[PDB]
Amino acid sequence: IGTYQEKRTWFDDADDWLRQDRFVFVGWSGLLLLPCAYFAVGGWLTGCTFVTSWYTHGLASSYIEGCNFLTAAVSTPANSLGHSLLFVWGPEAQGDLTRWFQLGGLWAFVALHGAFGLIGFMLRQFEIARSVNLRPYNAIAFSAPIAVFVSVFLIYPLGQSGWFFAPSFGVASIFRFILFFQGFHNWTLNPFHMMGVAGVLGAALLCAIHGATVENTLFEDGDGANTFRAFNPTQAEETYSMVTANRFWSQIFGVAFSNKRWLHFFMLFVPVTGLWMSALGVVGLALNLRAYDFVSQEIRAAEDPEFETFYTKNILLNEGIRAWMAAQDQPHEKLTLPEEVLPRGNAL
Amino acid sequence: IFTVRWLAIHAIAVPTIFFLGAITAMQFIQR
């Protein structure tokens, strides 16, 4: 600290023990990331095998009832619970664990511990980048998945009626969440979601293109027919011919990369930007502020009985979702709908 | 031993083995 005496205290001993090379590094974030993450994965795994969801959702989402990996899920609490943190010691469970389960408390446990585990994992990336003395572009990239986690598992149920409308920790419940936004929100039509789709598809495109181009322009670097044995970290020369790659993609696609930095920063930028745009769109849907309908098209459809497009068809299929799916997805709302008022056309 | 690697691999090993033994019991349960 600037050639000072720096008298050693318990802090320096603890820092010296935490910043050590082991099989798995601990650091300061190990005070948070390790317990929070281990509790999150253990809570999800325990809820997916034993903790039932019969009380809250009126369904089975655990292995102990007859569900598979693609069926079991740590389910959210009931909508009447609102937005309670739902502690095991709170007014809900009153200190009782065996009924803290089957009431959605384990969902809140997993969600809070996962959020703090993600916080600790970015702190992990930051402090390890400090130890290796490298820029934390990994943390810069990781800022987007946690933005998605917050906007999806926290902001959306916080803005809507309660945790019941949040995604439950599972597979088929996530699929229900997806179809829920499809029918109730028309999330495909939201421009921010279109940006998120473009970002992920472009990121996978960059992944495949970069890997294929580097692996097909990787020089000889030896005599053996296996290219992987020709790589050596001791030499400082570049493994692949960037000028050859640039010429190839310039003559195929028309545009090509000239800078490794700009290439890798693009690979960094596209998924982060797409995921932040999707996070902003889900923040918009957290307040039920939808890109659901087009005013000109709905007016033209109302005043023209023979003008129809795929948007009108999509609206109708959304009504199919709502009418035939909310009746069972929302047991708290008590939809005892007769099945002659549901929209159901010819034969099917 | 009881080192950091030992603690981590045991915290991942022991409950996963318990859960696998549990689920192998769960497979033969019938209504």
């Binding site: 023990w17 935490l18 601990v26 005070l31 010691w89 709170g90 007014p91 200190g95 | 009881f2 080192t3």
Partner: peptide, 30 residues
């Protein structure tokens, strides 16, 4: 008066205190 929810919160504060003490002892050990 002291409602049961507040009493439970105070025991929760004590529980978090002993959990932090336990993780501090665990990291100062080994």
């Amino acid at each position: 008066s002291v409602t049961p929810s507040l009493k439970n919160f105070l025991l929760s504060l004590v529980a978090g205190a002993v959990v932090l003490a336990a993780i501090a002892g665990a990291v100062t050990a080994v």
